[PDB]
C-alpha cells in the first residue's frame, strides 16, 4: 500500500494500556500466583505470552475471570514479566534471573528466555 | 531503574492485537457508523482516541456493547482510522483526506489531525 506510519504509535498505545492497568480500568482477569493476585487485560496477556494465548483462545477458559498459575511459579518473577508485557522493560537482576527465566519459559515468552540464557552464559 | 528493553515489543503487541481483531477474538464492542459496523477491543480504542477514552471511562457507557457514532461520520474514514489504531499505518489519500481529518477531529486523534492539516496545506 501507500500508507504513512506514525513511528511512536505502538509505544503510545502500550503506555496507555499500562496506564489503564495501573488504574484498574477494564481489566478482565486476575492471575493468581500462590498468595499473590495480579489484575490484567486478557488481550495484552495473549499478545505477549504463548501460554495466555492458548488459555484465552480456549472455548471454556476464555470466559474465566480468575486463572491460577502453577504453584512453582514465583510471584516476583511473574510481576517482573507482567511489567515487561505492559512496558517493554525487563527488570533483570542477578537476584531474580533464575525466577524470571523459569517464569518466561512457563509463560512461553521466547525473547525473554533468550536474553536470560545469554545473561546466564556470560556469568559462567 | 536498571531495566533492559526489547525494541520490537510494542510493535509485536500491536501486531497481535490486530490479529485478535481480524479473528474477532475477545472483541467487546461494536462501533456503528451509519449502515456499517466495526468490532473492536475497548482498551485499544481508549488507548488511541480521546473520544473513546472519555466514553469507556464513563461509569454507564463502559458497560455498553454497542456505540453509535454521529451520523456525519464517514464509515470509510472510520475504517481507515480503526486500521491505523491497530497498525500505526494510515492510508491517507487525496480522495479520503477530508473524511479522515474530520473523523480524526471527532475521535480526538491529534497526531492524525496534524498530518492531515500538513498534507492539505502542501496541496494549496
Amino acid at each position: 500500500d501507500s500508507c504513512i506510519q506514525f513511528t511512536r504509535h505502538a509505544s503510545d498505545v502500550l503506555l496507555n494500556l499500562n496506564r489503564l492497568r495501573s488504574r484498574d480500568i477494564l481489566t478482565d482477569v486476575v492471575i493468581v500466583v500462590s498468595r499473590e493476585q495480579f489484575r490484567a487485560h486478557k488481550t495484552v496477556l495473549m499478545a505477549c505470552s504463548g501460554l495466555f494465548y492458548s488459555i484465552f483462545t480456549d472455548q471454556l477458559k476464555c470466559n474465566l475471570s480468575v486463572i491460577n498459575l502453577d504453584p512453582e511459579i514465583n510471584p516476583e518473577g511473574f510481576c517482573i514479566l507482567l511489567d515487561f508485557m505492559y512496558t517493554s522493560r525487563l527488570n533483570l537482576r542477578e537476584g531474580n534471573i533464575m525466577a524470571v527465566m523459569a517464569t518466561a519459559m512457563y509463560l512461553q515468552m521466547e525473547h525473554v528466555v533468550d536474553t536470560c540464557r545469554k545473561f546466564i552464559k556470560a556469568s559462567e | 531503574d536498571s531495566c533492559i528493553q526489547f525494541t520490537r515489543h510494542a510493535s509485536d503487541v500491536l501486531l497481535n492485537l490486530n490479529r485478535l481483531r481480524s479473528r474477532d477474538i475477545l472483541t467487546d464492542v461494536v462501533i456503528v457508523v451509519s449502515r456499517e459496523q466495526f468490532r473492536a477491543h475497548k482498551t485499544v480504542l481508549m488507548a488511541c482516541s480521546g473520544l473513546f477514552y472519555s466514553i469507556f471511562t464513563d461509569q454507564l457507557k463502559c458497560n455498553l456493547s454497542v456505540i453509535n457514532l454521529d451520523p456525519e461520520i464517514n464509515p470509510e474514514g472510520f475504517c481507515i482510522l480503526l486500521d491505523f489504531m491497530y497498525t500505526s499505518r494510515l492510508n491517507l489519500r487525496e480522495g479520503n483526506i477530508m473524511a479522515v481529518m474530520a473523523t480524526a477531529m471527532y475521535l480526538q486523534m491529534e497526531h492524525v489531525v496534524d498530518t492531515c492539516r500538513k498534507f492539505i496545506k502542501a496541496s494549496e
Binding site: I4, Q5, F6 | -
Partner: peptide
C-alpha cells in the same frame, strides 16, 4: 510520520 514516515514512509514505512
Amino acid at each position: 510520520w514516515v514512509i514505512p
